[PDB]
Amino acid sequence: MNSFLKSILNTPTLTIRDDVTKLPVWKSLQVKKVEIYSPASVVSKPLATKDQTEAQVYTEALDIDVKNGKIIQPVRLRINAICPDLSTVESIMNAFNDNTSTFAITSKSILADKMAIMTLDVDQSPDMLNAAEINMEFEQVEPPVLNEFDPAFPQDSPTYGVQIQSLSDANLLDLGAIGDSISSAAKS
Amino acid sequence: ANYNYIVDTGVIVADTADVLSDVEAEFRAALGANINLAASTPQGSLVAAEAI
Amino acid sequence: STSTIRTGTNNDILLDDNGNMVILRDVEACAQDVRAAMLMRTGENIFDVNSGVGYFEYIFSPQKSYDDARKSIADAILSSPDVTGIEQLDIDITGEVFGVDAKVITIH
Amino acid sequence: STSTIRTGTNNDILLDDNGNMVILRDVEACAQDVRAAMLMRTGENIFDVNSGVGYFEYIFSPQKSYDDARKSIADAILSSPDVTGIEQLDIDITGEVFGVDAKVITIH
Amino acid sequence: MKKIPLTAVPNQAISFNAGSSYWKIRLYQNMDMMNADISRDGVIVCHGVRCFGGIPLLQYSRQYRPDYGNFVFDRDADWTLFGDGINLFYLDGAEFAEYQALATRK
Amino acid sequence: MLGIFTSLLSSRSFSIVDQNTNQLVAADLRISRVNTRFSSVGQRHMLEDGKTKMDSRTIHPMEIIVEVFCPSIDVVDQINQLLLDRDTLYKVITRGMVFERMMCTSEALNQTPDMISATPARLTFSQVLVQNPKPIMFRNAGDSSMIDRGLALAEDVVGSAGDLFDYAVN
Amino acid sequence: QLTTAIQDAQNDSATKILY
Amino acid sequence: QLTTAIQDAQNDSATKILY
Amino acid sequence: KRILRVTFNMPYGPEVIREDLDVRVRIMKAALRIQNRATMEIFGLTTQLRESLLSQFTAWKHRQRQVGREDELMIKVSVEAGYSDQGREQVSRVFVGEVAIVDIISPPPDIGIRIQCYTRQIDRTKTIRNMPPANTTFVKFVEWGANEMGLNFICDTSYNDQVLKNPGRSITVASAILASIQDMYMPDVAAFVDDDILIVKDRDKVIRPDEVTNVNSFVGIPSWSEWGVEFQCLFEPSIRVAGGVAVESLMNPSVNGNYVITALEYDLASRDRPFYIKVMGSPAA
Amino acid sequence: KRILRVTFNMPYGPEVIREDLDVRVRIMKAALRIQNRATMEIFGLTTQLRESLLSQFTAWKHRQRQVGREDELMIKVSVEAGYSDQGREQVSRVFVGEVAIVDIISPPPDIGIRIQCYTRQIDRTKTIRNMPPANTTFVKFVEWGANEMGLNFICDTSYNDQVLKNPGRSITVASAILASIQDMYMPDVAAFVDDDILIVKDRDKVIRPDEVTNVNSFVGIPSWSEWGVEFQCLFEPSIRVAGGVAVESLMNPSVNGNYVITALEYDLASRDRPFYIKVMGSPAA
Incomplete structure (x- = not known):
């Protein structure tokens, strides 16, 4: 029951980081249960088959059909915790109310990433006069697809085509071309 | 049943599935309408031989 | 209504006294066909490949379970026409003997 | 079917006895590629950057929990083609050694 | 020169509109070569054409004339190396005439 | 259940054998319960006089729900790639009950203070319905039934006839 | 739905001249 | 399904464009 | 055991889609000038089957190209449905027609096509090869129309021996x-095409008593x-x-009596409840 | 983080309805003569906003009154949709048109309006101010039509140098x-209006290679x-x-290849799942 003697490679420490700033958020958030549901969807209607072919030429066809017939639904977590401080709860409600919020929940050994809050329940009961029991739910916005990508430098980036539609006229202290020429001749 | 696999525009060769089906139909018409043409039975062995 | 040329225990064509070929029908034909299908090693039919009993990959090997062998024997028995099901597939082992007994419930 | 130029422990191109370059295919190529991918510090690809092992942020630093190091190594291993998955990954730590042991289950 | 898409299967058939005509080629492994059945506009043109590298598939003037085109394998046909390594190219009338002109002095 | 010997005091009960490469996977799960529920649907048809003809029956795919304990992170990752493995079918052998053409539909880990070392996990597989349960194959590599590719719209390349000729010469 | 299509059909048959 | 009826009220178009 | 087959006709041959695949065929037929319709939703298509069918089904090669002189322009598909028990079959034919529309209703993981066929979708025919009669009777104009369309005809009406000046040169x-045979004399005698048989008769009479x-x-x-x-x-x-x-109802x-049929609504689903045919009928004279 | 704006144009100014309110815009554009349409379901309207918008949208003042010589007869509304993350925006333009119909779909406690906008609903125009060319080629008739409608034109076709006698005097x-530019030459070359640009091109060509x-x-x-x-x-x-x-599909x-677009199915819901566009495309030449 000495709980500080945690394992080295399977440490039971929930660490909710923030993908924007990569800093641990909502510390002092004593966790009581973590459930990770990872669903999927398989074919329901019988798949067609084309027999009277050979060994191993049916195999890759079936493999492609199978890889084509399942759809992976995102991961969800359901954290049950006990907030001891008002600051943690105010931050949790603010993060929930913020539309743009991606975090990285790390359970005992999972590193579920790109995860956003769906539901947030705060229960205040007469048996927990200080602290309040919290029940949060998280959903994966985007699976960690490895962005191979053309990195490390501003050049070498791919062209992104912003198809503009209507150009505005002008503003500021500009009188057509003489205004433009004065602005340019200012060397600023 | 063999059709004309020679014809004039070169030899027309069909799939072994079609050839085996033709041999199976011949054997079914010859021996019996409901004969077990399984590969482990003597008639099935003869069918496989005439399919090769 | 299965029918099969009558064969002996040596498993060739065995003729009658008149020098004819007997065409067993229904019950005896199905029994002979099941016995023949249980004696066929897998990968022996070049037109089915996957058919046949796994006598070397599921039996006769230092294996962990014989449930794969049970599945293979059941599939081989059911593959024969007019078999429907297996009432009992008793599988007993003596020191070496891999005894198998079937109770096929052929309809005809 | 992966293919890779034969390299030694020094990580250079190691030629054969006739001064040719041997192209390993399948299992040996996958093993060499996994080993090479586990030695690349993160940010060394100016064409991936995000790829590689974080030897200086997860390992080699006063890191509280080695789960991040485990996931970084697992991602680096799985990045190699035809690796499918990892059977076992031990992260035993001796006095000053961060011993890692993988059991890749490459298809071929 | 139009490469015809192919897949690494032993025996297959592909139909397409090339050179203002409806071509259909059935390629199959026969013993230890590849044979091709070629049909243009429904009516079959040839059966059992043994396939070879550089050698045109349609070989009699009754088939590839006038300006119908022809099919050429860069290497000896092998379905195991279909898709990559081995290709089938379609030549129009003028381009096939040029290919034959280069081919008659080799 | 009965029906088979073992005469062998080391038979493992549960097995998840990958169909391709015919290898074991997740060979360290501590199974706790298996539930293999079948399913099928009727076509009740009331008709005029007080009566309802059931017509025929459609066999819905089999589902298996397995409660297990994962004792190691490697096993947990094996289950995760089992769920994420979209291109292989698995064969589940629970107790003399072989099931082929099976893929992981769902999976749920549970981390609670009742199990701090291991993690309970509920896996659910569902059978992939196939038109032919038993397919017909062939031994040699020459004699497939032909497969038709339909209209292809032959794509365009530029090499001129001279390049093709030099290629054939080489 | 179909009421949208009905409204569309009606709007087609409105022009600036009565005859 | 009104979509099938929409797809049916399009078949009245022969090869004649007449135009 | 319901047994439902969708049999296409393509250069390779007939590729029968059986009832093991999830198939749903809604056929609507009637005694009108309108082409009878069949909407069939087929799920469980493999990639190869999809490429072999949907690529052939197209509305091109007759608008921006030529590739056309006869059939094979569009794929003709028949539907054979029925029951089967104790080993005996009951597979009759319920539709013959050419595809016109292709779509997908259900996205992955069940990639299921929905295709729309009409009977006699070869309307882009040889622009009337044989000229219609100058002055003739109704029966003979009907015979000319049947001969032009290539279909055998059943003409049973009391208007046959009525001369028409100039029957249908527009x-x-x-x-x-x-449409023309339907247009003339259309209080009762409405002509239609059922499968490959062109039926011209009075609406209160039966084809086969x-x-x-x-x-x-x-x-x-x-x-x-x-x-x-x-x-139903x-x-x-x-x-x-x-x-x-x-x-003969209970x-x-x-409603007991003898009726002739005017409209038919087949709804056949191998892997679903609806396997009914709905009949519209009128008193028979 | 979807960002959807419905921007009206009224005498007060532009009153942009953002994505915070429950908005749902279903647009369907196509390469035809028909005006592309957008249905708009907007909830959470206040009393003042309803008074400002619905009272302006009307079909009067041009039938039982006069109040019309130019625009401001009916309110013109544009749609700017897109995504936004990390601070950068992606708000394009997806529809420009005038309202014709307004109704209410959801009663209290959520008074939700549903308006119906059509592109180029200003057909209440100066009844053709300038006479069409007497004899002219197709390109010049198209230029006259674009000038009359006030829209810039993209005429890219092989039928431009074909003369017409009386090209649109009815x-x-x-x-x-x-409708007229569509009516003439309708095997392939169908002209349409996309936003404020009148496009006359062959159906198998891309406006923009x-x-x-x-x-x-x-x-x-x-x-x-x-x-x-x-x-989609x-x-x-x-x-x-x-x-x-x-x-480039998986x-x-x-189905891989180069295609031109014929139809478009925008369905944008800020506070609901559907945020998709469906594309009908045909082979491009």
């Missing part, structure tokens, strides 16, 4: 022939209608369009 | 101009059709009508 394509279908079992209740009796039934491979029916005793 | 209003859109991510599956490839996608602010697409490998 016709542009083969399909409009049916000896082929009445005694009906005793219905789904629901055989109810009255504006014209005759309307009722389980699939019986003996009920055609414009055939004779001998309704819930409704007043 | 035209009554500005809208009928597009340099503006092909490489598509690799699809929702569902990129499928075949009786014409070309049909596929998440909102990309670079896909117009009649544009070129470079489909599920269906043979």
Whole structure:
């Protein structure tokens, strides 16, 4: 029951980081249960088959059909915790109310990433006069697809085509071309 | 049943599935309408031989 | 209504006294066909490949379970026409003997 | 079917006895590629950057929990083609050694 | 020169509109070569054409004339190396005439 | 259940054998319960006089729900790639009950203070319905039934006839 | 739905001249 | 399904464009 | 055990889609000039089958190209449905026609196509090869139309020996022939095409009087209608369009009598509940 | 983080309805003579906003009164949709048109309006101010039509140098101009109006060879059709009508190729799941 003697490679420490700033958020958030549901969807209607072919030429066809017939639904977590401080709860409600919020929940050994809050329940009961029991739910916005990508430098980036539609006229202290020429001749 | 696999525009060769089906139909018409043409039975062995 | 040329225990064509070929029908034909299908090693039919009993990959090997062998024997028995099901597939082992007994419930 | 130029422990191109370059295919190529991918510090690809092992942020630093190091190594291993998955990954730590042991289950 | 898409299967058939005509080629492994059945506009043109590298598939003037085109394998046909390594190219009338002109002095 | 010997005091009960490469996977799960529920649907048809003809029956795919304990992170990752493995079918052998053409539909880990070392996990597989349960194959590599590719719209390349000729010469 | 299509059909048959 | 009826009220178009 | 097959016709051959795949065929036929429709949703298509079918189904090669002189322009598909028990089959034919529309209703993981076929979608025919009669009788104009369309005909009407001055030289394509035969004399005698048979008859007469279908079992209740009796039934491979029916009901005793058929609504689902045919019928004279 | 704006134009100014309110815009554009339409379901309207908007939207003051010589007869509204993350915006323009119908779909406690906007609903024009050319070529008639409608034109076709006698002297209003340009030469070359640009081009050509859109991510599956490839996608602010697409699919490998766009199915819901655009495309030449 000495709980500080945690394992080295399977440490039971929930660490909710923030993908924007990569800093641990909502510390002092004593966790009581973590459930990770990872669903999927398989074919329901019988798949067609084309027999009277050979060994191993049916195999890759079936493999492609199978890889084509399942759809992976995102991961969800359901954290049950006990907030001891008002600051943690105010931050949790603010993060929930913020539309743009991606975090990285790390359970005992999972590193579920790109995860956003769906539901947030705060229960205040007469048996927990200080602290309040919290029940949060998280959903994966985007699976960690490895962005191979053309990195490390501003050049070498791919062209992104912003198809503009209507150009505005002008503003500021500009009188057509003489205004433009004065602005340019200012060397600023 | 063999059709004309020679014809004039070169030899027309069909799939072994079609050839085996033709041999199976011949054997079914010859021996019996409901004969077990399984590969482990003597008639099935003869069918496989005439399919090769 | 299965029918099969009558064969002996040596498993060739065995003729009658008149020098004819007997065409067993229904019950005896199905029994002979099941016995023949249980004696066929897998990968022996070049037109089915996957058919046949796994006598070397599921039996006769230092294996962990014989449930794969049970599945293979059941599939081989059911593959024969007019078999429907297996009432009992008793599988007993003596020191070496891999005894198998079937109770096929052929309809005809 | 992966293919890779034969390299030694020094990580250079190691030629054969006739001064040719041997192209390993399948299992040996996958093993060499996994080993090479586990030695690349993160940010060394100016064409991936995000790829590689974080030897200086997860390992080699006063890191509280080695789960991040485990996931970084697992991602680096799985990045190699035809690796499918990892059977076992031990992260035993001796006095000053961060011993890692993988059991890749490459298809071929 | 139009490469015809192919897949690494032993025996297959592909139909397409090339050179203002409806071509259909059935390629199959026969013993230890590849044979091709070629049909243009429904009516079959040839059966059992043994396939070879550089050698045109349609070989009699009754088939590839006038300006119908022809099919050429860069290497000896092998379905195991279909898709990559081995290709089938379609030549129009003028381009096939040029290919034959280069081919008659080799 | 009965029906088979073992005469062998080391038979493992549960097995998840990958169909391709015919290898074991997740060979360290501590199974706790298996539930293999079948399913099928009727076509009740009331008709005029007080009566309802059931017509025929459609066999819905089999589902298996397995409660297990994962004792190691490697096993947990094996289950995760089992769920994420979209291109292989698995064969589940629970107790003399072989099931082929099976893929992981769902999976749920549970981390609670009742199990701090291991993690309970509920896996659910569902059978992939196939038109032919038993397919017909062939031994040699020459004699497939032909497969038709339909209209292809032959794509365009530029090499001129001279390049093709030099290629054939080489 | 179909009421949208009905409204569309009606709007087609409105022009600036009565005859 | 009104979509099938929409797809049916399009078949009245022969090869004649007449135009 | 319902047994439903969709049999296409392509250069490779017929590729029968069986009832093991999830198939749903809604056929709607009637005694009109309109082409009878069949909407069939087929799920469980493999990649190879999809490429072999959907690529052939197209509306090109006759608009921006030529590739056309006869059939093979569009794929002709038939539907064979019925029951099967104790080893005996009942697979009759319920539709023959060419595809016109291709789509997908259900996205992955069940990639299921939905294709739309109409009977006699070869309307882009040889722009009337043989000229229509100058002055002739109705029966002979009907015979000319049937010969032009290539279909055998059943002409049974009291208007046959009525001369028409100038019967249909404004016709542009083969399909409009049916519309013309429908246009002239259209209080009762409406001509239609059922499968490959062109039927021209009075609306109150039966094609085959000896082929009445005694009906005793219905789904629901055989109810009255504006014209005759309307009722749904389980699939019986003996009920055609414009055939004779001998309704003998229990819930409704007043609807008993002999009726001819005007409209038919097949809804056949191998892997779903609806396997019924709905019959519109009118009193038979 | 979807960002959707409905921007009206009223005497007070532009009153932008943002994505915070429950908005749902269903647009359907196509390469035809018909005006592309947008249905708009907007909830959470206050009493003042309802008074400002619905009272302005009316079909009066041009039938039982006069109050009309130019625009301001009916309110013109544009739609700017897109995505936004990390601070950068992607708000393109997806529809420009005038309202014609307004109704209420949801009663209290959420008074939700549903308006119906059509492109170029200003057909209440100066009844053709300038007379059409007496004899002229197709390109010049198209230029006259574009000038009369006030829209810039993109005329790219092989039928431009074809003369016409009386090209549209029965035209009554500005809208009928597009119907006429569509009416003549309708095997392939269908003219349409996309936003404020009148496009007259062949159906098998891309308005813009340099503006092909490489598509690799699809929702569902990129499928075949009786014409070309049909596929749905998440909102990309670079896909117009009649544009070129470079489909590169995974599920269906043979639908890959270059296609032109014929139809477009925008369904944008800020506070609901559907945020997709469906593309009908045909082979491009």
